Amino acid sequence: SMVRVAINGFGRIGRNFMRCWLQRKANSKLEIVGINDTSDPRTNAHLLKYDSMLGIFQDAEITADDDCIYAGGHAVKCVSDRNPENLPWSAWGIDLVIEATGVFTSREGASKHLSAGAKKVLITAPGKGNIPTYVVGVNHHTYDPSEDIVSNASCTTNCLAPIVKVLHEAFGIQQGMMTTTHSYTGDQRLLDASHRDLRRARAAAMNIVPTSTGAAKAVGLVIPELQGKLNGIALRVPTPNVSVVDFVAQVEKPTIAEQVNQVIKEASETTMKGIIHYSELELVSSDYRGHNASSILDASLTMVLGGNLVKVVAWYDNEWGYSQRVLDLAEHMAAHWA
């Protein structure tokens, strides 16, 4: 029988995730039976169906009443309570909560779902404090089925970590720096306005906006040999989706661009198939909407100096690709459910 899933937070990730599940529903061990969100079912149904980035959902009918949303005649119960302690998880027999609000990323925060009755939580963001973090294709097999709260990290860490692993195994990464040139996200204001972070306050579609990021350090969680060896920053720019990681590493074994490319091409066809895609095409951000890989290496941009300083560039669809990984991680947990 199925693992019973509720989505907490029906936002860009919550709705991308839902759309990913609807496309892969026939082979799945997950059944999405509930959603909680600030908004009501009719608003959620409307936004699930009409998406400025994904287009109109055509695969099946989407409908709503006061209580439920219906996707292809699958009924999903809706509730709207900002306090996860109050949610009907025991009553709905919820096994796994997908925590996509961006608000309950600490153990104590996420545990509120457990005390409301869910058996496990998968947080769609980096965890705060001691929360086991997974990137599919890198360390997802180390998942321990006894764990009640996990994190699927960030979009950026999902893009960077698999490249780093391949490069580390082939060349030995000593140190590395990252910049993600990233689409704007919903934590940025539309026009200049009040915000705790003075950069996130500024008009998102009008500016290049630097922010600090934990994404590079977080690679050290999932590749423990590299802990404390990576750092970077983010630059948000006026696109609404699709991002790119720029990674410059100091490596031990001297190499050249051709060889770096070859090694990532070989991984994309074997150990990292479905996770890293290797491309020699001269494409731009739009072309990567809806791409299922965590990282698309842009081979033409790869360069090396003095044998040891390696630059690689990898695209990622930060909403859809990441949501596909969230789903992969959930399917994995369901296949390993004690």
């Binding site: 600030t38 900002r82 609000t101 961006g102 608000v103 963001a125 980096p126 960030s154 979009c155 950026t156 993600t180 990233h182 996200t185 919903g186 934590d187 204001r189 306005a193 009040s194 915000h195 705790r196 972070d197 996130r200 922010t211 990021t213 934990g214 994404a215 983010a234 948000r236 991002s243 930060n318």
Partner: peptide, 21 residues
């Protein structure tokens, strides 16, 4: 100070959201 309090109480509010891109 009342602002820090407001973001503790309401971390999903527009003034408060911090997403780790």
């Amino acid at each position: 100070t009342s602002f820090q309090q407001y973001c503790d109480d309401n971390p999903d509010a527009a003034e408060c959201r911090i997403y780790d891109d």
